[PDB]
């Protein structure tokens, strides 16, 4: 009875919103590595002791499949990548006819025909002079013209830029921070499937650090589930969707390139250098990855159990290797040690439910963001490379199309980088704060 409208400013309420997030990192943690693309362009430091405010009795709706934080992360990674490569040597002078022969010196049968020894006429500083040089190329980067004449694979389609020889692409944790006027809500519910209401919601200033690891089929160095393996998808029934599986216990994978390479610096113009592969010291052997067999077998058993909960207790689940298509999506991709390893995962997905050595190949000329027209040439890395990584999740697709769903088949998939992000950002949402509110009171002016 006789209540009046009052106005309150500073009311703690919010709405869903899309804004620009700032990139921040732990400055001490870069340890002077200012040549790391991720550190130099995410220069602003994070605050020590990031705070988290639990919000008692606050329920909020999260949806990882429509989360614009993913789209923004995707766009910014591509942008930084391109800026990193902008101020560097172009290899258009390198798109010449090559005269190639086989590398046959102390080479295993397992790589016969894998490497080619190519000689060519390339420029020098003075326009008037030319020089004869050679380099060993991986077969995947070289294409036959009309059996000794070859060209680099991208001479018809795109320009090639050599990656900057001092720049590191090693992932570091990156934190996304809200601008003032916005807040990030974090879902800490266990067994959260990505789309439902979240009971335990807290407010943070910045996200935890996420390493921008680039990979296909398997997800490396991500977060683990704490209770059990969690299977998330936009739509389970629809076989056109990717299924993201988060493991609770990691699987360790040991990868190497055993060949001892010597890099050769070639002058190509005034102030311009090209880095060639030189020659190999010692025997030539295949690059490969080792996955503990028992651990992998246990890991699938857990994944299968969770799939059965959604697909039926008497449903047979089969794993199979990937379908044909571009190398970039049919195989696993590491980007480790500075070399681009493309690994054959069929040994991991060959079972029916009801150490494993994976051979790998190296490719130097690549198109990371599925774009056509901008190719990067990775300079050679000297010496022997070894990487030990954590498998934290999988991207699977289901074939569908079976008769009466008698059995189901799953295969490694992914390749759309957005899903690598969605696997880490599913717990976060960005909201706008709207401080002005109205309510009745027992007062009059």
């Amino acid at each position: 009875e006789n209540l009046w409208v009052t106005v309150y400013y500073g009311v703690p309420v919010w709405k869903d919103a899309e804004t620009t997030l700032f990139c921040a990192s732990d400055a001490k943690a870069y340890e002077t590595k200012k040549h790391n693309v991720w550190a130099t362009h995410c220069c602003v430091p994070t605050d020590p002791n990031p705070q988290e405010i639990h919000l008692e009795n606050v329920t909020e709706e999260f949806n990882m499949w429509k989360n614009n934080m993913v789209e923004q992360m995707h766009t910014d990674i591509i942008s930084l990548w391109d800026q990193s490569l902008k101020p560097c040597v172009k290899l258009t002078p390198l798109c010449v006819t090559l005269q190639c022969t086989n590398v046959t010196n102390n080479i295993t049968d397992d790589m016969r025909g894998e490497l080619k020894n190519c000689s060519f006429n390339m420029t020098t500083e003075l326009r008037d002079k030319k020089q004869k040089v050679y380099s060993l190329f991986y077969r995947l980067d070289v294409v036959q013209i009309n059996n000794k004449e070859y060209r680099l694979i991208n001479c018809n389609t795109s320009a090639i830029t050599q990656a900057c020889p001092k720049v590191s692409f090693e992932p570091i944790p990156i934190h996304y921070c809200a601008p003032a006027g916005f807040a990030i809500l974090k879902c800490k519910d266990k067994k959260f499937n990505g789309t439902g209401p979240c009971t335990n919601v807290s407010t943070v200033q910045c996200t935890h650090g996420i390493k921008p690891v680039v990979s296909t089929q398997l997800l490396l160095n991500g977060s683990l589930a704490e209770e059990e393996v969690i299977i998330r998808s936009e739509n389970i029934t629809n076989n056109a969707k990717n299924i993201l599986v988060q493991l609770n216990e990691s699987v360790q994978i040991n990868c190497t390139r055993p060949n001892n390479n010597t890099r050769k610096s070639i002058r190509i113009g005034p102030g311009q250098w090209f880095y060639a592969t030189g020659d190999i010291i010692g025997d030539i052997r295949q690059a490969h990855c080792n996955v503990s067999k028992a651990t992998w077998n246990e890991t699938l058993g857990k994944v299968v159990k969770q799939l059965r909960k959604h697909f039926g207790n008497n449903t047979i689940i089969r794993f199979a290797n990937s379908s044909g298509g571009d190398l970039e999506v049919t195989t696993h991709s590491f980007n480790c040690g500075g070399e681009f390893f493309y690994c054959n995962t069929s040994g991991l997905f060959n079972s029916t439910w009801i150490s494993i050595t994976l051979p790998c190949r190296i490719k130097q000329i690549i198109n990371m963001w599925q774009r056509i027209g901008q190719a990067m040439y990775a300079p050679p890395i000297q010496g022997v490379i070894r990487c030990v990584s954590n498998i934290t999740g999988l991207i699977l697709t289901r074939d569908g199309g079976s008769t009466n769903s008698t059995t189901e088949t799953f295969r490694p998939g992914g390749g759309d980088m957005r899903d690598n992000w969605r696997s880490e950002l599913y717990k976060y949402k960005v909201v706008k704060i709207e401080p002005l509110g109205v309510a009745p009171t027992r007062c009059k002016r």
Binding site: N2, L3, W4, V5, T6, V7, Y8, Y9, G10, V11, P12, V13, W14, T19, T20, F22, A27, T40, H41, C43, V44, P45, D47, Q51, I53, L55, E56, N57, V58, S79, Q83, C177, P179, A180, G181, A183, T203, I433, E434, P435, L436, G437, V438, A439, P440, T441, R442, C443, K444, R445
Partner: protein, 144 residues
Amino acid sequence: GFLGAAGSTMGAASMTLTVQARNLLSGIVQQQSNLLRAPECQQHLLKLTVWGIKQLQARVLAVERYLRDQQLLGIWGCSGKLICCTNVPWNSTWSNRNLSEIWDNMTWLQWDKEISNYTQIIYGLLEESQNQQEKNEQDLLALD
């Protein structure tokens, strides 16, 4: 904590309105000036033309929204206050319930969801009321 009162009841949350009001500007100045401690960050980041423009758009907009809300409070005669009481009666259509249920044992998030689309009506009413008050003051001061 900045949204710490989100789960508190309306009449409890209202005890600490000042912190939300402050964060809107203090956060901007600290993030842009005090957080940006290493001079090489600005020197390098200025080379990313697109990031430079996007970040400015975000700051400028934050200011524009702040000012729009302040102008609105000024128009309604609530300038300088976190708590403002005015002479516009509450209509049961907007909400018909006891002032016990509304102020206490209910949070602000719930309240905002319930008022919903009635907000625009209220704002128009507040603006007209203040204009009538200003005219009346001007006339009284002319009577001596």
